[PDB]
């Protein structure tokens, strides 16, 4: 119903070792749709999704061309954070960004966002209200009152909620077929024996999409968080996830668990056990 | 300030001996981005792995899949080999196809 | 599509 575009700037210096390699990617939902790296033989906006192919070539020039831009841009950007933090020309570091729009299950606005960071740490965030600025600290703080100046807060506004938004239903549409598909996880539960008293109860989710989705372990109907396992949804590799939660059991008492699957695809969550 | 790689080794299909498959490594949480990791068969690394483009989660970790064709047996051992700024050596997981 | 740059704005 709700879907989403987002676009991931990674600028990494490396001091001795050239100027800072510029990366970015753009995604709708879980689907990664374009990509661009500096460091190519031949920097260009390179497609990553099928239904992205049909754009034509203005539409791959005008792309490679703001990511030119950016590149040197950011370059830019790094000196003046190093600087900022009177840094030593010595060290290598990164400024993360992502921006983009969410969309509700009718198609408007749901909001927009615009996140900077430094070296991981949140540096500068533009506010829901696509108006103001949020500076993490002093350094940030001359970027704000920069971006102030150059009324970027209204640019972003203006994109955020126009050709953000346009751009984004229009990829829906042209790849309906798969962005708008939710494929639901196949669910089972698989028992491994630790000793003579406990085993453990795996329950499995394959094959699902989007990534968002929610797996708990109920013992007697009680959510046992404390003591399940839940490991990292991962990429199959074939635009599906895969995730699994386990908890270690007392032998004998494996029918008193319950596994329960919360996915957009399910027409109705789930609920099951081990089946000898 | 940084942040060491959380990993894991899996395959795409669920692992049947003798059909082909796709051997998988997740390297994730991470953070700086530079990264080495190597698919091994039998300790020896694989040759054309290939990679997915550098991205990363709302806390700004980075992720990362590793991922080449390959044919699960009973005997033969695979892992995944991940070298970090945070790590004081590179860290071998075995591939468990129950994970 | 991505954002265009304003003129061409720097942290």
């Not at chain 1, 040197?72 to 010595?90: D, I, K, M, P």
Request: include cysteine; glycine fraction near 6%.
């Amino acid at each position: 119903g709700s879907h989403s575009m987002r676009y991931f700037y990674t600028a990494m210096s490396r001091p001795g070792r050239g100027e800072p390699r510029f990366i970015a990617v753009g995604y709708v939902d879980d689907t990664q749709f374009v990509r661009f790296d500096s460091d190519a033989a031949s920097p260009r906006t390179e497609p990553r999704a099928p239904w992205i192919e049909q754009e034509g070539p203005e539409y791959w020039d005008r792309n490679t061309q703001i990511f030119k831009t950016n590149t040197q841009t950011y370059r830019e950007s790094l000196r003046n954070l190093r600087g900022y933090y009177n840094q030593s020309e010595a060290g290598s570091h990164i400024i993360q960004r992502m921006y983009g729009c969410d969309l509700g299950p009718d198609g408007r606005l749901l909001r927009g966002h615009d996140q900077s960071a430094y070296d991981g740490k949140d540096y500068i965030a533009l506010n829901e209200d696509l108006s103001s600025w949020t500076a993490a600290d002093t350094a940030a703080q001359i970027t704000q009152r920069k971006w102030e100046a150059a009324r970027v807060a209204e640019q972003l506004r203006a994109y955020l909620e126009g050709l953000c938004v346009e751009w984004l239903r229009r990829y829906l549409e042209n790849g309906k077929e798969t962005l708008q598909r939710a494929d639901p996880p196949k669910t089972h539960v698989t028992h491994h024996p630790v000793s003579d008293h406990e085993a453990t109860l795996r329950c499995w989710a394959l094959g699902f999409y989007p990534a968002e989705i929610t797996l708990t372990w109920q013992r007697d109907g009680e959510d046992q968080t404390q003591d399940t396992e839940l490991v990292e949804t991962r990429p199959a590799g074939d635009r599906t996830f895969q995730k699994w939660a386990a908890v270690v059991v007392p032998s004998g008492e494996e029918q008193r668990y319950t596994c329960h699957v919360q996915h957009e695809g399910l027409p109705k969550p789930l609920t099951l056990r081990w089946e000898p | 300030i940084q942040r060491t790689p959380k990993i894991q080794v899996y395959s795409r299909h669920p692992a049947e001996n003798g059909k082909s498959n796709f051997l998988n490594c997740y390297v994730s949480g991470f953070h700086p981005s530079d990264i080495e990791v190597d698919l091994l068969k039998n300790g020896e690394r694989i040759e054309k792995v290939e990679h997915s483009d550098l991205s990363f989660s709302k806390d700004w970790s980075f992720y990362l899949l590793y991922y080449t064709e390959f044919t699960p047996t009973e005997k033969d051992e695979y892992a995944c080999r991940v070298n970090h700024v945070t790590l004081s050596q590179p860290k071998i997981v075995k591939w468990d196809r129950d994970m | 599509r991505p954002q265009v740059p304003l003129r061409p704005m720097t942290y």
